[model samples]
Target: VVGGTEAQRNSWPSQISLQYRSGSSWAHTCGGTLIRQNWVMTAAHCVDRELTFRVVVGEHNLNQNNGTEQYVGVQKIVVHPYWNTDDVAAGYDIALLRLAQSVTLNSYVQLGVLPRAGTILRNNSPCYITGWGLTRTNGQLAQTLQQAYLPTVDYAICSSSSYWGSTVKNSMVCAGGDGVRSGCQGDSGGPLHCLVNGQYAVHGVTSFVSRLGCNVTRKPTVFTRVSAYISWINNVIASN
Candidate 1:
């Protein structure tokens, strides 16, 4: 989060920390949304590398214990078959991780609601990018979860030459090209919560940011449109 504020512990109950065992301790790598009791929605890029992974639900601070946190091992990972690490611009950057155990629901931990298939927000629709990503373009990850208001930038404008151009597709959602506030490193796989119909829904799976920097002009954070893959997600979960 280039420009964000601390989020209330119970604000985004579905938010989770995707971490990997680094040496003797686990380190936060990306963010995810708890889609089911034992299933998580994240970016395929986050698990492209082979590593021991875990998901922490109800987490607030990275280094400190939040008391409400529930850590679980990753039982299985299913990346979209079409996802190619070398070509993220082609879209299909979504993934699903089955947890070792189902987590109990509470005020701090709950399933994230998904938007219906083909649902698309209007231009400039209000949204927020939440994660433990960087606070600056080239800074370390935040110790606490941060959220920045990133308004949606519709396809027509985001695909313009001055914006993300051909790098973005209809399968992706672009937000926060303002350059002041945007998703940064370590925020990948997080959720882009959009307020629609007086309710919030998980609409995006954080995918990438500008290589030039986290917050770049006309280069908003790009996300895998969750709505585009609702059917795929349901199929994967059912098959598993």
Candidate 2:
């Protein structure tokens, strides 16, 4: 994330690194949230390339070894059937990955709580975006995980012409448009943790940012609204 700080260990237990197999090694491509012991929630664009992917839970420092890290192969990938890469602005950017084996939960790794279906946060709701994405637009990825406070921008303001305009849909959440902090390239598919009723839940999956730059004025980080897909998620998990 641009203008972010190193996230404390175990602070975001559900955060994970989604990596793709590169020549001789695996490389981090995006971030994901562990929604189940054997399932991960991420962005469809993250896996659109159809590369061999894996999920790393309890990951903090990407360049060095972390004792809490658990590397697991992806057994199945269930991208939203309606997802259209060319129509990201039209919403449906979510996907799920099933793990080859179930993971054990601990302080460093656990399932993320989801909000009830159709739940909506009021304007400027308290939230944070966490990931190992770039610290600046077009910059190299961070060696460690990072997080930034990103208050929610309701659909009304976000969809306004001066803001994200029509690109901001009701099925998306916009946060951190302050032009200083925002999700960068590598942050896609990460979690947007929002506090509600004294509890924290994963409210969004980092989806996109302004094409002009990572941190652009009035161009907050856009995310796939988790609440909008709660039913689809449940159905997929139950049927799969």
Question: Scored by CA lDDT, what does every candidate get?
Answer: 0.95, 0.95
Cα displacement (Å) at residue 40, model 2? 0.3
User: lDDT (0-100) at residue 162 of candidate 1?
Assistant: 96
Residue 220, model 2: Cα distance from true site in angstroms = 0.4
The digit string of per-residue lDDT tens for model 1 on 1-240 reads 888999988899999999999999999999999999999999999999999999999999999988999999999999999999999999999999999999999999999999999999999999999999999988999998999999999999999999988999999999998979999989999999999999999999999988899889889999999999999999999999
lDDT of 2: 0.95
TM-score result, candidate 1: 0.99
> Which ranges in model 2 have alpha carbons more than 4 Å from their true place?
none
lDDT (Cα, 0-100) at 62 in candidate 2: 95
TM-score of each: 0.99, 0.99
State residue 193's C-alpha deviation in candidate 1, in Å. 0.3
